[PDB]
Amino acid sequence: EMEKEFEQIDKSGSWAAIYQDIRHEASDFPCRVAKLPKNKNRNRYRDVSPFDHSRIKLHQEDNDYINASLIKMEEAQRSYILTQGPLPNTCGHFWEMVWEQKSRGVVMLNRVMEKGSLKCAQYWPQKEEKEMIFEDTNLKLTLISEDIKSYYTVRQLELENLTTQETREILHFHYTTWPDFGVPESPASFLNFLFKVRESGSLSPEHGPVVVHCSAGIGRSGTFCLADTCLLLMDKRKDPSSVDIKKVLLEMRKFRMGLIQTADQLRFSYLAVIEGAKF
Ligand SMILES: [Cl-]
Ligand SMILES: [Cl-]
Ligand SMILES: [Cl-]
Ligand SMILES: [Cl-]
Ligand SMILES: [Cl-]
Ligand SMILES: [Cl-]
Ligand SMILES: [Cl-]
């Protein structure tokens, strides 16, 4: 069904058209907090801001602002936090958010440097013996171990609230092979990656929402949540063919602007849902 639609769209060369339809129909809500002068250095891209209604609020007495959005997919029964790649001055805020929201997993869809350009701060420790302390938010972060595979890495991180000395194990799922240009030829690796995250238990309702990010937290990140949600709906719905990817994406864009940044990413999402459903 979705296969047929895909084939027709591919044949017609109309991905760019469908995508522009989505941009035109997308929700528009205020982002007043994100745009306050005092928050200028908390935003990686001035063009990418969380809506006020869905933004994640930090709990400590300071400025509560982080560029992150709660995407709550009611029918699919899953929530995600989408956020930008942390900046050098917001790494403490990032881990404060993970703590306060009770996240079990963090999903990273970029390399820290791509095409020789910085897309994200080095917000986790690369070496066991060199832990990170975030003094502003009073958190400690230690690399316990990592499982480096050919197309992704999973790291076992220990996050300690230095105030209470409570510790939590955070799983860091790092997809390291997203192409420098465009999207993956095949969704196979991306899909295997998604299934790994699912198998880990990180997406379970017993935990706080998974934190998903790329550089701006809308493009590859959008692809990840969109595919996951659509596959959920297909599995749950009485009539699995009734899942409309464009409608699902518009629903998600009620919670964060700009999800899926290109027609190629839209096409890739279709591809991934189709292939994933077969599995
Ligand atoms: Cl201000
Ligand atoms: Cl990296
Ligand atoms: Cl490449
Ligand atoms: Cl699942
Ligand atoms: Cl990115
Ligand atoms: Cl639908
Ligand atoms: Cl857009």
- What is the distance in A from the centroid of ligand 5 to the CA of 165? 34
Could you tell me the end-to-end alpha-carbon distance of the chain, in angstroms, rounded to an integer?
Answer: 16
- What is the distance in A from the centroid of ligand 3 to the CA of 96? 33
Catalytic residue among 31, 91, 120, 214: 214
**Chain mean position to CA 167:** 24
- What is the distance in A from the centroid of ligand 5 to the CA of 117? 11
- Output phi, psi for 114, to 5 deg: -135, 135
Nearest-ligand number for the alpha carbon of 25? 7
Tokens standing for 8?
A: 């027709």
Residue 187 β-bridge partners: none
Resolution value (Å, 1 decimal): 1.9
Tokens standing for 224?
A: 């990840």
Q: Enumerate residues 6+ apart whose C-beta is below 8 A from 227.
A: 187, 190, 191, 194, 269, 272, 273, 276
Please give the tally of structural domains in the chain.
Answer: 1
For residue 217, the one-letter residue type is G
Its domain, for residue 255, covers 1-279
DSSP string of the chain? -HHHHHHHHHHHT-HHHHHHHHHHHS-----TTTTSGGGGGG-S-TT----TTTEEEP-SSS--EEEEEEEEETTTTEEEEEEPPPPTTTHHHHHHHHHHHTBSEEEE-S-SEETTEE-S---S-SSTTS-EEETTTTEEEEEEEEEE-SSEEEEEEEEEETTTTEEEEEEEEEE----SSS--SSSHHHHHHHHHHHHHTTTSTTSBPEEEESSSSSSHHHHHHHHHHHHHHHHHSSSGGG--HHHHHHHHTTTSTT-S-SHHHHHHHHHHHHHHHH-
Experimental method reported for this structure:
X-ray
Q: Enumerate residues 6+ apart whose C-beta is below 8 A from 11.
A: none
Nearest-ligand number for the alpha carbon of 201? 4
Is 31 a residue of the active site?
no
CATH number at residue 260: 3.90.190.10
